């Protein structure tokens, strides 16, 4: 549908003019929606849309040839972690919407086309999430997730938000 475009002027430039030039931007806009660096977003994916690609935006830039790029730090759904779904004491204390609403942060970063961004979402701490659920706007939790810890895809290890290997 409609394309994301840059908001305003670049924040920074790298390289000489020409094929090596890179113009960095803090925000993209589409109609009345704005997404900025530090926000989390849902990305368009190929299939299985119960596991949307969700990432934190680290930086965005345009390179030569009208290429709009976003650098993304991916979150992982608990099903996606190598311990799988069956792995999810710790089981007792976890919310009953854990499989649907919890996300692990990771250090897995990728560069992607800005036009694969679908829409903004929120990934907050557990206590923040529970307080937001008491309200009316965030009643229904649309696009709202909470952080369950860290996943290391290279080792398969999961860590709590306190850094405790799980």
């Amino acid at each position: 549908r409609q394309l994301w475009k840059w908001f305003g002027k670049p924040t920074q430039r790298r390289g000489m003019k020409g094929k090596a030039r890179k113009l960095f931007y803090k925000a993209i806009v589409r109609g009345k929606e704005m997404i900025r660096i530090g926000d989390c977003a849902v990305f368009l994916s190929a299939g299985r849309p119960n596991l949307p690609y969700i990432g934190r935006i680290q930086s965005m830039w345009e390179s030569w040839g009208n290429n709009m790029v976003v650098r993304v730090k991916w979150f992982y759904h608990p099903e996606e972690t190598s311990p799988g779904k069956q792995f999810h004491l710790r089981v007792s204390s976890q919310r009953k919407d854990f499989m649907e609403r919890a996300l692990y942060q990771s250090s897995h970063v990728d560069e992607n086309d800005v036009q694969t961004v679908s829409h903004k979402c929120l990934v907050v701490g557990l206590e923040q999430y529970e307080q937001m659920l008491k309200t009316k706007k965030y009643q229904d939790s649309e696009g709202l997730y909470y952080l369950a810890g860290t996943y290391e895809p290279t080792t398969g290890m999961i860590f709590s938000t306190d850094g405790v290997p799980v």
Binding site: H108, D110, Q115, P153
Partner: peptide, 8 residues
């Protein structure tokens, strides 16, 4: 662009 890509 059509769909995003993930490495591993």
């Amino acid at each position: 662009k059509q769909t995003a890509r993930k490495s591993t």
